[PDB]
Structures are given as structure tokens and as C-alpha cells.
Scaffold this active site. Structure first.
Site, PDB file in Angstrom:
ATOM      1  N   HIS A  61      53.263 108.810 106.959  1.00 30.72           N
ATOM      2  CA  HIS A  61      53.282 107.581 106.458  1.00 30.72           C
ATOM      3  C   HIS A  61      53.817 106.495 107.466  1.00 30.72           C
ATOM      4  O   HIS A  61      53.439 105.362 107.200  1.00 30.72           O
ATOM      5  CB  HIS A  61      53.819 107.613 105.175  1.00 30.72           C
ATOM      6  CG  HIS A  61      55.223 108.551 104.919  1.00 30.72           C
ATOM      7  ND1 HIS A  61      56.362 107.599 105.215  1.00 30.72           N
ATOM      8  CD2 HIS A  61      55.497 109.453 104.636  1.00 30.72           C
ATOM      9  CE1 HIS A  61      57.494 108.553 104.874  1.00 30.72           C
ATOM     10  NE2 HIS A  61      56.827 109.825 104.908  1.00 30.72           N
ATOM     11  N   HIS A  91      62.034 103.135 111.512  1.00 31.87           N
ATOM     12  CA  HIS A  91      60.626 103.160 111.328  1.00 31.87           C
ATOM     13  C   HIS A  91      60.150 101.927 111.195  1.00 31.87           C
ATOM     14  O   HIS A  91      60.827 100.778 110.738  1.00 31.87           O
ATOM     15  CB  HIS A  91      60.263 104.164 110.185  1.00 31.87           C
ATOM     16  CG  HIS A  91      60.662 103.615 108.802  1.00 31.87           C
ATOM     17  ND1 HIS A  91      61.855 104.093 108.326  1.00 31.87           N
ATOM     18  CD2 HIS A  91      60.157 102.747 107.981  1.00 31.87           C
ATOM     19  CE1 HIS A  91      62.018 103.493 107.106  1.00 31.87           C
ATOM     20  NE2 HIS A  91      61.085 102.885 106.864  1.00 31.87           N
ATOM     21  N   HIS A  93      56.792  99.281 109.354  1.00 32.21           N
ATOM     22  CA  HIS A  93      55.484  99.406 108.218  1.00 32.21           C
ATOM     23  C   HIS A  93      54.666  98.109 109.038  1.00 32.21           C
ATOM     24  O   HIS A  93      55.123  97.238 109.669  1.00 32.21           O
ATOM     25  CB  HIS A  93      56.058  98.920 107.058  1.00 32.21           C
ATOM     26  CG  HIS A  93      56.888  99.809 106.275  1.00 32.21           C
ATOM     27  ND1 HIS A  93      56.607 100.623 105.448  1.00 32.21           N
ATOM     28  CD2 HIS A  93      58.182  99.630 106.497  1.00 32.21           C
ATOM     29  CE1 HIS A  93      57.821 101.409 105.106  1.00 32.21           C
ATOM     30  NE2 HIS A  93      58.684 100.982 105.686  1.00 32.21           N
ATOM     31  N   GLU A 103      56.892  94.320 104.122  1.00 29.75           N
ATOM     32  CA  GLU A 103      57.033  94.747 102.942  1.00 29.75           C
ATOM     33  C   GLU A 103      57.799  93.560 102.400  1.00 29.75           C
ATOM     34  O   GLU A 103      57.101  93.061 101.274  1.00 29.75           O
ATOM     35  CB  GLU A 103      57.848  95.919 102.995  1.00 29.75           C
ATOM     36  CG  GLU A 103      56.917  97.141 103.329  1.00 29.75           C
ATOM     37  CD  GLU A 103      57.624  98.505 102.865  1.00 29.75           C
ATOM     38  OE1 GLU A 103      58.698  98.636 103.189  1.00 29.75           O
ATOM     39  OE2 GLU A 103      56.615  99.119 102.704  1.00 29.75           O
ATOM     40  N   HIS A 116      62.573  98.831 109.644  1.00 30.74           N
ATOM     41  CA  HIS A 116      63.812  99.429 108.987  1.00 30.74           C
ATOM     42  C   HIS A 116      64.516 100.162 109.766  1.00 30.74           C
ATOM     43  O   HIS A 116      64.300 101.392 110.108  1.00 30.74           O
ATOM     44  CB  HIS A 116      63.200 100.098 107.743  1.00 30.74           C
ATOM     45  CG  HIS A 116      62.309  99.165 106.706  1.00 30.74           C
ATOM     46  ND1 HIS A 116      61.557  99.610 105.646  1.00 30.74           N
ATOM     47  CD2 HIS A 116      62.257  97.679 106.564  1.00 30.74           C
ATOM     48  CE1 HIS A 116      61.124  98.558 105.200  1.00 30.74           C
ATOM     49  NE2 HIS A 116      61.712  97.324 105.713  1.00 30.74           N
ATOM     50  N   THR A 195      61.355 102.074  99.873  1.00 29.58           N
ATOM     51  CA  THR A 195      60.334 101.749  99.484  1.00 29.58           C
ATOM     52  C   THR A 195      59.158 102.436  99.622  1.00 29.58           C
ATOM     53  O   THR A 195      58.003 102.228  99.415  1.00 29.58           O
ATOM     54  CB  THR A 195      59.754 100.223 100.539  1.00 29.58           C
ATOM     55  OG1 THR A 195      59.676 100.959 101.601  1.00 29.58           O
ATOM     56  CG2 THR A 195      60.818  99.116 100.408  1.00 29.58           C
TER      57      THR A 195
HETATM   58 ZN   LIG Z   1      60.784 101.640 105.452  1.00 28.58          ZN
END
Ligand SMILES: [Zn+2]
Length: 257
Positions: A61, A91, A93, A103, A116, A195
Site C-alpha cells: 500500500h 512513508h 501517499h 490525505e 508521514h 489513515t
Molecule cells: Zn500515512
């Protein structure tokens, strides 16, 4: 199992993880005009000089750059936080297009991506115990926009070829996460959640106002990663972001005027 596709994406997560509809879910939209300056917030303390990165992992992911958190080497404190929080991993997104990927949003604006840096409260002994506590985690969120390259990101970009697919990892020692910070530590803070599933409501969110810039070539290499494992049909790892969730009974505080 859960993911970011049409059939297993964020709108489906509540079926396995009912807390998806809970009272302090993340991310959220940050309405800058409604966030209130809180003069009782302390300056943030990011102490990453002794950080020890170990490994980079594609977990299907995102990719996590993992750190040795068996001692106080890279810690976050101050700001809204009581006590000491140790860096365990960071990591990102990101989107399929530069117009989406973050996010958190800022007055509904979506950034190209969001970093993050994940930290856990040392009073709880390990990460597994911390996530079971309302103040177990502190996540430092940093927006990315596309413009000039970020030099301190290049080392991460160039190892991605070696972890293209789910379950692959590579040695990633001596990486300095200070190279990913913007100039200013001005931030918004609110209580929220992981999240991704299990979506536990254990996070103090600290979201920096100032984005970092990365290049189009940098984000293009991130978008070449795969959600799938090796020898499986290729699905590009893109749009691995959860959209904004209802703020409900929460106030977002600003560290700055
Ligand atoms: Zn994250």
C-alpha cells in the site's frame, strides 16, 4: 482485503473496520480560517541528528523507510506533545496526477503527495502497545508539491526500482530524514487516527503548513511502484490516499498567527 481499488477502497473499509466511521478519524480538511492560534503550544522539537534508518519496504500500500527505534535516537517532542515520541518509519501517499495525492487538505486544496513521519510514545514501551492508546502516536505530516527537486529525497527515489513490488525490501542505512523537512516548523494539530486500517484513534497529528517541493521526475518514479507482488498483473501504486473525514467534535489548533 482492503486497498485503494474500486472494490476494496476507503468507502468499503468500514465493513471490516467499523471505527472507520468513528469520532476522531483522519485525515481531515484543515480550514485555515477556523483553526485557532493556540499560544500555549510549545515550539516543536525534531531531533533527528542520531537517526538510524535500516530498511525500505514495499508493503503493498506504500513504501516504509524503517528506523531503529530500540533507543531514543530520532525523537519528536514539544508542540502539543507530552513526553517523548520515537521515529519508527516514514512513508508517503500520492496521486496518479499532480492535482491529488495528499490525505489532509488545506481549505479543500489537495497537494501532489503527503509525507508521514510516524512516531510512538515511549511511555508505552513498543509500537504495538502505543497504538492502543489515545496518545500513543505522533505523526508529522508534510505536504509535497511539484516544482524543483528535493535533493534529500533522491536517495529514496533511486532505490524504488529494487522494491517495485509488494513484499520486496532493500537495505536502506544512513538515510537522514532531516533532508525531507521544510524550512519552517509552523504547524496545525488535532487528535485523529491512523489513515489506513486498522484506523485506530491513537494519533496526535502535527501537519506542517509549509510544503516541500519535489520534481516531476521524482514523483514520476514514485508512480512506477506496484501494489501487486512479483509475477502478478501490474497495478501501478498510485492514489494510495484516504480522503478527508468528518471533523465532528474536534478543533484544529495553529502553532502560528
Ligand atoms: Zn500515512
Amino acid at each position: 482485503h482492503w486497498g485503494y481499488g474500486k472494490h476494496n477502497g476507503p468507502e468499503h473499509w468500514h465493513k471490516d473496520f467499523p471505527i472507520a466511521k468513528g469520532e476522531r478519524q483522519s485525515p481531515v480538511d484543515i480550514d485555515t480560517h477556523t483553526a485557532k492560534y493556540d499560544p500555549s503550544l510549545k515550539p516543536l522539537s525534531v531531533s533527528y541528528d542520531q537517526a538510524t534508518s535500516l530498511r525500505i519496504l514495499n508493503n503493498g500500500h506504500a513504501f516504509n523507510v524503517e528506523f531503529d527505534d530500540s533507543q531514543d535516537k530520532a525523537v519528536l517532542k514539544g508542540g502539543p506533545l507530552d513526553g517523548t515520541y520515537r521515529l519508527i518509519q516514514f512513508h508517503f501517499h500520492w496521486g496518479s496526477l499532480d492535482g491529488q495525492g495528499s490525505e489532509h487538505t488545506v481549505d479543500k486544496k489537495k497537494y501532489a503527495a503527503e509525507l508521514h513521519l510516524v512516531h510512538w510514545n515511549t511511555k508505552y514501551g513498543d509500537f504495538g502497545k502505543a497504538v492502543q492508546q489515545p496518545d500513543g502516536l505522533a505523526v508529522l505530516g508534510i505536504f509535497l508539491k511539484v516544482g524543483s527537486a528535493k535533493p534529500g529525497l533522491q536517495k529514496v527515489v533511486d532505490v524504488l526500482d529494487s522494491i517495485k513490488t509488494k513484499g520486496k525490501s532493500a537495505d536502506f542505512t544512513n538515510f537522514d530524514p532531516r533532508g525531507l523537512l521544510p524550512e519552517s516548523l509552523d504547524y496545525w494539530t488535532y487528535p485523529g487516527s491512523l489513515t489506513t486500517p486498522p484506523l485506530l484513534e491513537c494519533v496526535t497529528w502535527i501537519v506542517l503548513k509549509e510544503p516541500i517541493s519535489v520534481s516531476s521526475e521524482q514523483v514520476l518514479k514514485i508512480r512506477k511502484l506496484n501494489f501487486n507482488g512479483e509475477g502478478e498483473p501490474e497495478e501501478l501504486m498510485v492514489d494510495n490516499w484516504r480522503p478527508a473525514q468528518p471533523l465532528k467534535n474536534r478543533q484544529i489548533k495553529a502553532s502560528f498567527k
